[PDB]
Design a protein around this ligand. Structure first.
Ligand SMILES: CCCCCCCC/C=C\CCCCCCCC(=O)OC[C@H](O)CO
Ligand SMILES: CCCCCCCC/C=C\CCCCCCCC(=O)OC[C@H](O)CO
Ligand SMILES: CCCCCCCC/C=C\CCCCCCCC(=O)OC[C@H](O)CO
Ligand SMILES: CCCCCCCC/C=C\CCCCCCCC(=O)OC[C@H](O)CO
Ligand SMILES: CCCCCCCC/C=C\CCCCCCCC(=O)OC[C@H](O)CO
Ligand SMILES: CCCCCCCC/C=C\CCCCCCCC(=O)OC[C@H](O)CO
Ligand SMILES: CCCCCCCC/C=C\CCCCCCCC(=O)OC[C@H](O)CO
Ligand SMILES: CCCCCCCC/C=C\CCCCCCCC(=O)OC[C@H](O)CO
Ligand SMILES: CCCCCCCC/C=C/CCCCCCCC(=O)O
Ligand SMILES: CCCCCCCC/C=C/CCCCCCCC(=O)O
Ligand SMILES: CCCCCCCC/C=C/CCCCCCCC(=O)O
Ligand SMILES: CCCCCCCC/C=C\CCCCCCCC(=O)O
Ligand SMILES: CCCCCCCC/C=C\CCCCCCCC(=O)O
Ligand SMILES: CCCCCCCC/C=C\CCCCCCCC(=O)O
Ligand SMILES: CCCCCCCC/C=C\CCCCCCCC(=O)O
Ligand SMILES: CCCCCCCC/C=C\CCCCCCCC(=O)O
Ligand SMILES: CCCCCCCC/C=C\CCCCCCCC(=O)O
Ligand SMILES: CCCCCCCC/C=C\CCCCCCCC(=O)O
Ligand SMILES: CCCCCCCC/C=C\CCCCCCCC(=O)O
Ligand SMILES: CCCCCCCC/C=C\CCCCCCCC(=O)O
Ligand SMILES: CCCCCCCC/C=C\CCCCCCCC(=O)O
Ligand SMILES: CCCCCCCCCCCCCCCCCCCC
Ligand SMILES: CCCCCCCCCCCCCCCCCCCC
Ligand SMILES: CCCCCCCCCCCCCCCCCCCC
Ligand SMILES: CCCCCCCCCCCCCCCCCCCC
Ligand SMILES: CCCCCCCCCCCCCCCCCCCC
Ligand SMILES: CCCCCCCCCCCCCCCCCCCC
Ligand SMILES: CCCCCCCCCCCCCCCCCCCC
Ligand SMILES: CCCCCCCCCCCCCCCCCCCC
Ligand SMILES: CCCCCCCCCCCCCCCCCCCC
Lengths: 224, 222, 224
């Protein structure tokens, strides 16, 4: 069942990427860079999850299955999602690439702490997990603080769209460390199959859902 | 013999890089970034192939995986496509989105090759096929939208671009062909033959390409 | 012993990063990108050395301890330090990102040769070490040649500051390959504890000391 779920996920990622490609052909004032980012996120994730479907992207460690292909996925897809969010805030204004790369750095560190925590046991595991959670808190502080202030500097209509996708992204993102802690990588309260379903459904919304809402909202700002 | 071929390769890469450095000192209207890219490609490849010469950049899996080849290509091949894109854009506005589209496709392509090499049976050919699909899209971009940019930069630039695009594309299709025929794939081609192909092809891909590319761009100065 | 030194190192990196953050809030004409770089260097190094403190970032090879987390640290922190130095040379002037990325490329290669040399034995070890030393020599030639000429083009006061931080960086940097060759990774003349103390004290000056001197000097060019 786990294999079939991963095949299905990869198929949905492909469909999402094809949809964003089709939107890119009639871009409605959204820069090409934002369509490229929107396409890479699901295609990379789809490839990583295909490796799990094929029985390759996992190994046995600490009497648990480490789905290491999830970290290979997230270390590329998640910094790209924050790049997408930052570029939304900066729509119609001067780009702040310092703030954008601040988020990329925090995010890559966050994913690495997750991988190291998964390979760790006892107190060491929760030290790495906690550092990752601290990185996520700083990402959320930037998202609702200085980055939202950039969105507000780009006017009422853009700031409304930004706030919507910031809440969409943030709601989904806090679910990942929650599921991690509850599942076999952490306290082992949630069953492996349950964790697998959560890390199938969440990313469908994080990777395809997010960019449908984001791109549609930006395209709507276009005065045709 | 395999060790000696790799030492010789590394020496040729070094000579190519030194030649591109010498050209960089009298640049004839070619931006410094294009000389840097032209130098990094062979120096990185030379270092990777040196590891094979020293007997380090390979492991047994029941055949030899020359993993240092993937460490080489994952850096050198995206840089080659960056060089090709910047040639198309010579004298005009840059399209960094198209450039990074090629970089993304190319890094994915090399990764599928590495995963395919570590894979067995149907799984191997699934990864190989995804890499081939990435290469086809790279070629579609190369002869489609990227060539259109070259044409927008005038007849003489477009002629040079078309020449180096065919040069790069002809060599690039050889890599997956050799991979499939050799011990990583169907095992029809002998290991020593595959080794020679993955010595001679890259000499043309990495040094040959940038000799033709830089000479052509420098000639546009007059 | 070695664990405690690494915990202490990580704490100093954290304090350094917090100081650079506080300076960033009253930036005195120094671009935000230069504060971000100054903060990432110690935070990354701190995390890498924390892994050694926890007994994770090392393994046994050729009867010796390979502190591989040092290379994970340097492969990110050292290119960022050269980026910081290049941006100092370019202060108040046109950026030369080609020269900056030339240094990044040389530097990443240098650290990789160090790691490969550490995993190598006999003549092979010293071939990789020598390639690393050649990369460092080219970095120093760029630093005191073309990069210094950029600094001179940005006026007397900037060029004086650049020359000071360039000599500071270069004096510390030549110590790393020297300690490597003398310690267990090389000729094995110095004890493991001696090498550990050098690769604790040097980086405190290379990562925190350097950016105190750099940022203070740049902030001083500000007319209040
Ligand atoms: C592109 C997206 C990332 C792919 C990851 C491949 C995962 C690794 C696959 C290699 C597994 C090898 C195997 O067959 O399993 C034994 C180990
Ligand atoms: C499990 C869901 C499976 C497939 C649908 C994948 C897409 C799920 C997200 C749909 C997009 C969304 O949230 O709605 C966007 C809206 O239609 C415009 O603003
Ligand atoms: C950064 C770029 C790195 C490039 C490095 C260039 C190395 C070229 C070697 C030449 C011949 C020396 C090897 C001769 C050894 C003979 C083999 C043997 O039998 O030992
Ligand atoms: C610089 C650019 C690329 C370098 C590839 C380095 C290849 C990695 C080689 C290290 C592995 C190694 O040395 O292990 C095998 C050998 O048996 C023990 O010396
Ligand atoms: C394995 C990688 C799969 C990548 C697939 C992407 C969806 C469709 C992308 C199709 C790209 C066509 C190329 C093209 O024509 O590019 C136009 C732009 O400009
Ligand atoms: C920033 C992260 C740096 C290094 C992580 C070190 C990796 C630690 C790997 C853990 C291995 C382990 O627990 O060994 C038993
Ligand atoms: C001091 C090295 C100087 C420059 C690097 C040039 C690299 C030249 C590499 C030649 C080394 C060589 O041939 O060494 C054979 C031996 O088997 C090894 O273990
Ligand atoms: C030890 C090496 C440091 C050598 C320092 C060399 C300082 C170079 C000064 C100079 O004028 O060199 C610029 C030239 O462009 C360079 O190729
Ligand atoms: C361990 C592996 C770590 C890999 C990290 C990879 C991170 C990739 C993300 C990069 C996002 C950069 C996007 C920049 C957008 C440019 C802005 C513009 O379009 O003008
Ligand atoms: C693991 C995969 C990492 C691959 C990284 C390799 C680097 C490839 C990227 C090249 C981009 C080059 C961009 C040059 C822009 C020049 C612009 C100008 O000079 O005006
Ligand atoms: C192993 C991979 C190595 C990773 C390298 C990480 C660091 C790369 C260096 C980047 C420095 C960024 C410099 C940007 C200059 C900004 C100035 C400007 O353009 O205004
Ligand atoms: C594996 C990497 C771990 C984390 C390191 C990430 C490196 C990126 C962070 C900082 C580099 C600074 C680059 C951004 C400056 C751009 C400013 C500008 O151009 O205006
Ligand atoms: C969980 C924690 C999320 C923290 C969100 C705080 C945002 C700060 C808002 C602001 O600075 O205006
Ligand atoms: C679930 C979503 C996570 C947390 C959202 C954080 C809310 C903080 C908003 C700050 C308000 C403001 O800055 O105006
Ligand atoms: C051996 C490989 C080394 C490369 C040297 C390049 C040879 C010079 C190219 C021809 C020069 C010219 O036509 O002016
Ligand atoms: C290691 C760093 C990995 C970088 C990301 C590589 C993954 C790339 C995925 C496929 C690229 C998607 C390109 C879409 C087509 C572009 C176009 O529309 O022209
Ligand atoms: C795209 C490929 C998806 C189909 C994979 C078929 C399964 C074969 C296998 O078990 O390796
Ligand atoms: C080898 C197989 C690859 C084929 C790719 C070549 C097709 C490119 C067509 C582009 C034509 C155009 O858009 O002008
Ligand atoms: C091997 C080389 C690959 C094939 C090149 C594809 C040629 C397509 C170019 C079409 C451009 C045109 O319309 O003239
Ligand atoms: C050995 C070095 C490799 C040889 C590449 C051959 C390419 C010859 C290019 C001719 C010069 C030119 O056309 O400008
Ligand atoms: C990771 C990428 C590492 C690439 C390795 C070596 C690149 C060396 C850079 C070439 C030096 C250029 C110096 C100059 O032209 O001023
Ligand atoms: C403000 C809205 C934020 C989210 C937008 C999209 C909606 C996503 C809803 C969450 C998806 C479900 C995740 C948990 C699934 C649990 C399945 C368990 C099966 C045993
Ligand atoms: C690897 C894909 C990441 C997206 C790169 C964004 C391209 C920058 C365009 C600037 C104009
Ligand atoms: C060894 C046995 C191989 C059987 C056939 C494998 C063919 C796989 C084709 C992959 C196509 C992928 C397209 C997506
Ligand atoms: C694996 C070796 C294959 C030998 C022939 C190569 C065919 C591709 C073009 C050269
Ligand atoms: C370990 C690397 C983590 C990245 C730290 C970046 C800190 C930037 C936060 C300040 C933004 C204002
Ligand atoms: C007690 C010393 C430990 C402090 C931990 C610092 C780690 C910072 C990483 C980011
Ligand atoms: C990393 C390898 C270096 C090659 C990339 C060169 C990029 C330089 C950009 C210059 C922009 C002006
Ligand atoms: C047991 C034998 C040890 C031999 C030590 C050899 C050390 C040589 C490397 C130091 C000199 C580097 C020179 C770089 C090029 C200039
Ligand atoms: C026995 C402990 C010695 C520690 C000395 C202090 C560390 C910094 C010294 C500078 C680095 C020296 C490198 C070799 C010359």
């Amino acid at each position: 069942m786990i294999s079939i779920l991963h095949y299905g996920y990869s198929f949905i990622m492909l469909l999402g990427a094809l949809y964003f490609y089709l939107l890119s052909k009639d871009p409605k004032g959204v820069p090409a860079s934002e369509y490229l980012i929107a396409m890479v996120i699901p295609l990379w994730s789809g490839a990583a999850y295909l490796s799990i479907a094929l029985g390759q992207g996992l190994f046995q460690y600490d009497d648990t299955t480490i789905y290491y292909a999830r970290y290979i996925d997230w270390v590329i897809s998640t910094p790209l999602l924050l790049a997408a969010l930052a570029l939304t805030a900066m729509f119609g204004g001067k780009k702040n690439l310092t703030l954008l790369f601040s988020l990329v750095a925090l995010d890559v560190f966050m994913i690495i702490t997750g991988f190291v925590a998964d390979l760790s046991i006892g107190t060491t595991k929760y030290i790495w997990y906690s550092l990752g959670v601290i990185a996520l808190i700083i990402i959320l502080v930037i998202t609702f603080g200085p980055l939202r202030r950039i969105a507000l500097s780009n006017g009422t209509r853009l700031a409304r769209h930004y706030t919507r996708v910031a809440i969409y992204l943030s709601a989904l993102w806090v679910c990942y460390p929650t599921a991690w802690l509850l599942g076999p990588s952490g306290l082992g309260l949630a069953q492996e199959l349950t964790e697998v379903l959560v890390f199938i459904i969440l990313p469908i919304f994080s990777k395809v859902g997010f960019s449908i809402v984001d791109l549609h909202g930006l395209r709507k700002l276009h005065q045709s």
